[PDB]
Amino acid sequence: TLRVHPEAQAKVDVFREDLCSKTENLLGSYFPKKISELDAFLKEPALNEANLSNLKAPLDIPVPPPCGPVNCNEKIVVLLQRLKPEIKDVTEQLNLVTTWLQLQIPRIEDGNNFGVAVQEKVFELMTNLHTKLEGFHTQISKYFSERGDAVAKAAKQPHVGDYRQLVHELDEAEYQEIRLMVMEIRNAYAVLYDIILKNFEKLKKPRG
Amino acid sequence: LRVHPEAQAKVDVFREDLCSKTENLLGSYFPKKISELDAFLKEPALNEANLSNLKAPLDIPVPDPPCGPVNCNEKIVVLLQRLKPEIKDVTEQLNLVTTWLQLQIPRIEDGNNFGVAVQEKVFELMTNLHTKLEGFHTQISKYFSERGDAVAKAAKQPHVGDYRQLVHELDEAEYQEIRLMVMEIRNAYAVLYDIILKNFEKLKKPRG
Amino acid sequence: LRVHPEAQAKVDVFREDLCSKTENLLGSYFPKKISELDAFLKEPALNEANLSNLKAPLDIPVPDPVKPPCGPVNCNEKIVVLLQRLKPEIKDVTEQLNLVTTWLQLQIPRIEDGNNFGVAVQEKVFELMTNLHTKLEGFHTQISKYFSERGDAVAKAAKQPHVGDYRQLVHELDEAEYQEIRLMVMEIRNAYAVLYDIILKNFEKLKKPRG
Amino acid sequence: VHPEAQAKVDVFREDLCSKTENLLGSYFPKKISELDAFLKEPALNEANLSNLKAPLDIPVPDPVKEKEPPCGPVNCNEKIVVLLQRLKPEIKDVTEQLNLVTTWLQLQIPRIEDGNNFGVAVQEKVFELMTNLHTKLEGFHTQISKYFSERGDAVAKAAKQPHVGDYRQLVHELDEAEYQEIRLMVMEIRNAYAVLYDIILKNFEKLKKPRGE
Amino acid sequence: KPCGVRLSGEARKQVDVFRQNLFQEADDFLCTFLPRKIISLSQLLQEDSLNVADLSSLRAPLDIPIPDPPPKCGYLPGNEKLLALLALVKPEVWTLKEKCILVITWIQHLIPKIEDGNDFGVAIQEKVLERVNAVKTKVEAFQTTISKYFSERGDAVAKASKDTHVMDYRALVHERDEAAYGALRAMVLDLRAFYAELYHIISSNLEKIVNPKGEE
Amino acid sequence: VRLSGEARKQVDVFRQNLFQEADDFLCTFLPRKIISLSQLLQEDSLNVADLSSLRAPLDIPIPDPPVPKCGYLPGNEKLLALLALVKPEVWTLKEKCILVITWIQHLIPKIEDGNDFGVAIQEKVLERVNAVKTKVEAFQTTISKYFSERGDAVAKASKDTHVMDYRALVHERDEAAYGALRAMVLDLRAFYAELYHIISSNLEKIVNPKGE
Amino acid sequence: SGEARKQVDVFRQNLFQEADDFLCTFLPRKIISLSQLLQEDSLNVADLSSLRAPLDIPIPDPPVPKCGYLPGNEKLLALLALVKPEVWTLKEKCILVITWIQHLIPKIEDGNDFGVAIQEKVLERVNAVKTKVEAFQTTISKYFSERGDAVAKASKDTHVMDYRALVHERDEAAYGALRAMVLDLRAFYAELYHIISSNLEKIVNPKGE
């Protein structure tokens, strides 16, 4: 009574073949294209600030309370405009390829499990990248949360000079993080492209 | 899988650039940074004979049975201006070398995995350095956050003598920590230089 | 320093009470509870067609800037009556699970070098009882968490009438609690079924691991 | 070879070994007797727990006489404080002698070799017990600061909100719990001396000489 | 004394009513329900609400008055676009958690008497049961993300209104929206993936899950 | 490392007291605890059929839709009565777990190579007694947390009168505490039975692991 | 590369010399000075009631005065000034020994790996000492913040006498902790020498030549 139904199997195989052809397009087109964009983006003068005093935004608070509008750091905001969709795309294609590799895992058997071990080793990297790239997503929300608290304390306590310095250091630290986050996203594409293309036969055909 | 000539060329532009960067770093940059940081350690800025030199002014009125501007510690700030770019460089070159080593990991094969074990052993040390060096970035932001709160609490409650001491203890601890960070960054360059050049045969070509 | 049979007799009285009670749980109580909870799942209290039925009244005054104290915000009626039925069900499973766990622990024989397959069977069935105990204790604490979180959401909504998300938060906690209560009843029924199944299957080795 | 460094560390180890023999031969039996005598005293054997209930004078208000906050000094629990004055120097002594014996055993660990490591396994087994005692006894040290912190917060809440009767109960429950904990902390300290004495004296051959001279 | 349970016909029938419904519901899950979810979730991903090109278009108007360098705030509603999307995603999250519980309880009943030898079928059952629980854990993580959105945005909105001078709290409210959308889209992809993965691992190992010992 | 005559006696006074107290635990004390805890479970305070009877009157003024000061809010006397019965039983079992742990640790012989399965049995029995002690310590944290959590719930309810969920929370903490306190006494009886069963079954190897 | 090769050889010759100077002369002198430090009367306080600083917060009568300046514990501030440098110096030398041993780890080759296994175990213990030394720094920094909060609560809530007891108990705990640090610091120097000197042949010369 309970068995594999060709009608259900056909509907799942439509998704399975669709997911495979997309993965081949990522290796064949999307991943090499992204490496060129991020290499080009790294060489731009936005991410290569010569002097760190350029990033210092106006923190107009009266020295010793009513306070005027303390704006966001303009140079960091326009970097986050480009970074956010790059974080979106890399997590999108990582999730797609992680799903593809899961559907290539064959029946659990007593032996002939080398190709299965190859899949597990490549899946180990995809899990580690997923942990790293989720960390990038949350830290941007944390930046505005921490800067807002530093600005709030600086306005309420004008006499305390460290709260003023904290806002500038959070800006400097965020700029330095965005540099590395762009590098890490490019490295993720390059390493994913590298590891899958080398092991593709054992990933696709784990038992021939 | 079917090959792609234009796609491969875009990744090879990055891969050739990444390989040429690593030869430059082992050849010149890493010995150069060891000499700079050794010279920096011997200067009088990181060899304060008496810790009372680091004690900043804390002009808050003492009550007896609404204050002036409390500035940042000048001697610690100027050390952080020199430290921050040294943290930027060591993390970037570590991230570059880590990516280089991942792309040298060959196809997963059933035997002849001693060279793979050498790569994994050297990769283990780079991951441990990456964990250590990432702690330093938030540490600088944490100093101004903790000092700001100590000065804020000292100003709100001038009668509590311990909050005044706390601000000076954070300064003494920060100087001592900054001193150790410069050594740890120098040792990171030295150990990376040492371990890679020793095992460079099996890192570059794990199966001969 | 040696075993005294006066003390041995008093533990064996407690031991045989657990045996006889475990017989009644498998033979009568567990099949009955599966039927009650199956009957409870099919009622219209746990089959709300539209989730807007669960939306409680939250009469907090929205301020007009051009032109604070609040009225008594009552609990969600439909969720409270479900919790009044759910709470005694949670109490029963944890009490009977504890009884069968205590029964199985006292069936563990002397520690020996070999002949430990029956001991491994007991450990395998005990693994399930530990995992169920962790799950069902989670259900116990989440009901207290619901009233705590809803109270804090209502308190923030009254304290901050201009923030529309705190009003929404209260309605979302109600929807989530209904959906959780529905699953907690299913999880409780499945606990009775899986306990009944695994104990009956392995009853000879659980009772007599070395013959 | 480093002769200056090998000399003074051997002088440190010989002095540390001399104190360890004094601990087993004299100090550890002495402490077990003191703590056994302390456990039998009437300070740690309260027949009725209502004896530990301290005065908690906060004005209990009602709304009818209100229609017709400030508070007096809420003192520490006297019977618990005097027990802590005796317990604190006892905790101080165990942690010091445990540290001393642990440092002695660490310096008895020989060269790392490929075999002949049964005596090394004996040292590691006895060291495990010393590590678990160190974790337990450090827990006692921080718990006393935790008691005064938790009681202060309960009294502060009880004073600021006198209408909440459970905060008044919370202060008395913290007192009852602390007395009961102090009672067990003395037992655990006595057992630490006894088990250390027992395990070291039995295995003294292989701890002293793991590879047999 | 001997411990011996002999089951009355009443009690055995009561459990047979449950077990026949469980095994029938598990069959209909794999046969029809699960393929239908892969089609409907795929159709949901082609909607314009889930294919937003620029995440800044999701930005709702905050309407808090900006101070000036030397008026109390009005009503601040939630993000309508995310509230519409949350109404589509929430039911899909709750249904898969229910079907994970079904498949766990179903496989639990297929685990036979523990006998020494012929245990590889039992090992396969455990390994599939592990992966189904892993899917359930990730589905429980989606519920915590959805509940945390409403509390976090409300606190961010409250900070922005209470401290009007701080413009980073206004950016935080809008960053909470973009992160919530990105999470909710990633959920629907993961939900479709989990249905596909649950079928693939069960269908591939179906003979050993159902008949671990090799009975005819 | 030679020991004096007094030094050996001082320890022998403790050791032979410890062995006697541990023997009295298993023979007389532990079976009596199974009888008394069984008799305690038959009491009316622990067999409350409807948990609505535990509901204490929370006398806080209900506000009207757009103030009276809050009177004295006492604790739940039914739970305070039940806590007085449970608390001593929790503290006593923690004391006896320490006795059994110290008793078995003294029975662990000199570490010798070979004939070590008796020592392995001792270690596994010691593990289970520590596992019981950890669960008994978890009961103490549950009891101490009840007093603080109810005080905060009553304080929130009195502060925020309009929020009726805080009133439900106070009553829910009472029902949860009751169910926990009943579950404790069942567990305490089970732990006495389990402690005897594991020690009595393996008593030859616990006392004489080497088989001398 | 000849210029750049010389730059590293200056560092490596400095590291091996500084590591040798640590084991020969520095470490034994630290055991003498820490032993000599442990003989002092500031570290052997007979009754801890002598360390009790005066709180001087006005005790309110039963049913308002300003609070005067409340200074820190000057006995502990003197002791903290002695312990702090000893903590920072050992963390300095742990980093030296870790970097010294890491440079002695040879090229990874199959076979004759027991010498490399000994180097890893010594490194593992030196890192374990560093983690305990880092725990002392967190204890020292936490004392100043915790006492300040305890004194602030005691001054704000004058009626609560347990906050006054907490301030004096924080001092006694800090004193007992600071004494235990100095004992541990001496022990770590002795332990670091013993493990390195016993295994020095295999640490320096792991492959056997």
Swiss-Prot record, chain A:
Tree of life domain: Eukaryota
InterPro entries according to UniProt: PA28_C (IPR003186), PA28_C_sf (IPR036997), PA28_N_sf (IPR036996), Proteasome_activ_PA28 (IPR009077), Proteasome_activ_PA28_N (IPR003185), Proteasome_activ_sf (IPR036252)
Any GO BP annotation: antigen processing and presentation of exogenous antigen
Pfam families: PA28_C (PF02252), PA28_N (PF02251)
Record's note on what induces expression: By interferon gamma.
Transmembrane segments annotated in the record for this chain: none
Record keywords: Proteasome
GO cellular component: a single term: proteasome activator complex
Self-association and partners: Heterodimer of PSME1 and PSME2, which forms a hexameric ring. PSME1 can form homoheptamers.
Family note: Belongs to the PA28 family.
Role noted for this protein: Implicated in immunoproteasome assembly and required for efficient antigen processing. The PA28 activator complex enhances the generation of class I binding peptides by altering the cleavage pattern of the proteasome.
This protein's name: Proteasome activator complex subunit 1
Origin species: Mus musculus (Mouse)
From Swiss-Prot, chain F:
Key words of the record: Acetylation, Phosphoprotein, Proteasome
GO cellular component: proteasome activator complex
The keyword Zinc-finger is assigned to this record: no
Species whose genome carries this gene: Mus musculus (Mouse)
Signal peptide bounds: none
Protein name: Proteasome activator complex subunit 2
Family that this chain belongs to: Belongs to the PA28 family.
Residues annotated with Phosphoserine modification: 4
An example Gene Ontology biological process: antigen processing and presentation of exogenous antigen
PANTHER family: PROTEASOME ACTIVATOR COMPLEX SUBUNIT 2, PROTEASOME REGULATOR PA28
Complex formation: Heterodimer of PSME1 and PSME2, which forms a hexameric ring.
Swiss-Prot/TrEMBL induction comment: By interferon gamma.
Function: Implicated in immunoproteasome assembly and required for efficient antigen processing. The PA28 activator complex enhances the generation of class I binding peptides by altering the cleavage pattern of the proteasome.
